Amino acid sequence: ITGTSTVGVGRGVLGDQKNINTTYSTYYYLQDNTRGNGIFTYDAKYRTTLPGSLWADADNQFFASYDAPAVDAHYYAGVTYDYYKNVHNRLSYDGNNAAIRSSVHYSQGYNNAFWNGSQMVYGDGDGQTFIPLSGGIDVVAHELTHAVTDYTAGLIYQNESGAINEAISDIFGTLVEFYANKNPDWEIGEDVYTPGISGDSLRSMSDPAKYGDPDHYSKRYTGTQDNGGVHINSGIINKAAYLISQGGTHYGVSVVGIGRDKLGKIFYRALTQYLTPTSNFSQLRAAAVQSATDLYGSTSQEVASVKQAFDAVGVK
Numbered sequence: 494i495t496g497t498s499t500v501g502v503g504r505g506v507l508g509d510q511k512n513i514n515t516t517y518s519t520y521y522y523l524q525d526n527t528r529g530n531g532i533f534t535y536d537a538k539y540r541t542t543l544p545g546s547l548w549a550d551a552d553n554q555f556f557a558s559y560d561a562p563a564v565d566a567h568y569y570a571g572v573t574y575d576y577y578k579n580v581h582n583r584l585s586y587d588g589n590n591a592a593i594r595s596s597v598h599y600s601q602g603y604n605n606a607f608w609n610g611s612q613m614v615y616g617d618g619d620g621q622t623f624i625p626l627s628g629g630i631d632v633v634a635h636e637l638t639h640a641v642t643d644y645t646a647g648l649i650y651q652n653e654s655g656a657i658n659e660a661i662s663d664i665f666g667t668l669v670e671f672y673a674n675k676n677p678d679w680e681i682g683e684d685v686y687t688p689g690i691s692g693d694s695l696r697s698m699s700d701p702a703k704y705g706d707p708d709h710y711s712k713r714y715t716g717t718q719d720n721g722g723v724h725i726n727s728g729i730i731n732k733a734a735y736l737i738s739q740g741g742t743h744y745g746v747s748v749v750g751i752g753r754d755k756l757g758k759i760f761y762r763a764l765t766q767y768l769t770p771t772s773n774f775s776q777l778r779a780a781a782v783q784s785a786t787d788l789y790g791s792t793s794q795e796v797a798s799v800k801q802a803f804d805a806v807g808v809k
């Protein structure tokens with residue numbers, strides 16, 4: 494909407510106070526004009542019509558329990574924008590400052606979040622398996638990164654290309670969580686998963702096997718569930734990414750870590766310059782090796798470590 498840029502204040506899902514960029518025109522709307530062509534957060538009002546209504550508030554204070562998922566969707570979309578712009582010189586998900594749209598309160602008790610081809614969507618959870626999913630910065634950044642992939646490599650969401658699509662969203666979800674630097678880890682969804690259980694998460698990049706996901710190509714899933722295992726086989730690539738950053742010895746193969754920033758530069762370059770819609774895991778290894786060669790040189794430690802990591806997970 495047309496109006497003037499303002500700064501509201503509220504609390505997120507986990508009870509933390511934060512400032513949010515709003516727009517005033519009779520009401521205060523969750524419309525952040527400070528980033529690209531705007532960040533816009535909508536209320537789906539427990540229904541499944543999208544996007545729903547641009548979020549409107551009478552006094553620019555967002556401390557109601559009902560407000561919390563919107564505060565965090567809006568704020569964490571901003572953090573994710575800032576990561577891509579400041580770290581990768583990428584302006585929004587299309588590279589041309591596309592408006593970022595999110596809806597919260599989608600459906601009733603909905604234990605998930607997604608990118609629907611046009612916008613991010615967050616359930617509230619059922620309060621047992623999940624609390625409102627926009628409370629996890631890694632979830633918000635995972636979803637926005639699906640939009641980045643769709644505009645870049647375009648990895649088809651099935652089988653190995655789909656498991657790479659998934660791992661790219663877990664990788665950059667995690668690097669955005671480290672960028673924001675509030676309790677960062679290599680786990681996915683821990684801030685919003687199972688409020689009655691501490692220390693768990695939906696997936697782990699450091700040890701995918703903790704939640705039944707493969708950590709080696711010989712354990713890949715080849716059935717038809719889950720679009721051919723895209724949230725399962727993503728563990729093989731998530732483990733490779735973790736080893737490139739952090740190092741380790743995995744099934745006897747040692748990897749020298751090169752740290753998160755270099756992981757991000759290598760996988761950002763692979764995603765935007767080498768991967769294609771039908772890339773498989775072997776092709777991802779070649780893309781990552783070439784990206785590391787462009788950035789660091791063919792005889793570099795970085796190239797060696799990429800090779801070691803994919804060797805450690807059985808991807809040639």
Ligand SMILES: O=C(O)CCNC(=O)c1ccccc1
Nearest residue numbers: 605606607608632681682695
């Ligand atoms: O792939 C998607 O975006 C849809 C499936 N959802 C997830 O992967 C997820 C991640 C973190 C927390 C909750 C759900």
Ligand SMILES: [Ca+2]
Nearest residue numbers: 550552554555
């Ligand atoms: Ca209010």
Ligand SMILES: [Ca+2]
Nearest residue numbers: 676677678683
């Ligand atoms: Ca965390």
Ligand SMILES: [Ca+2]
Nearest residue numbers: 631680681682
């Ligand atoms: Ca995490």
Ligand SMILES: [Ca+2]
Nearest residue numbers: 686687688690
């Ligand atoms: Ca938990």
Ligand SMILES: [Zn+2]
Nearest residue numbers: 635639659662
């Ligand atoms: Zn995903």
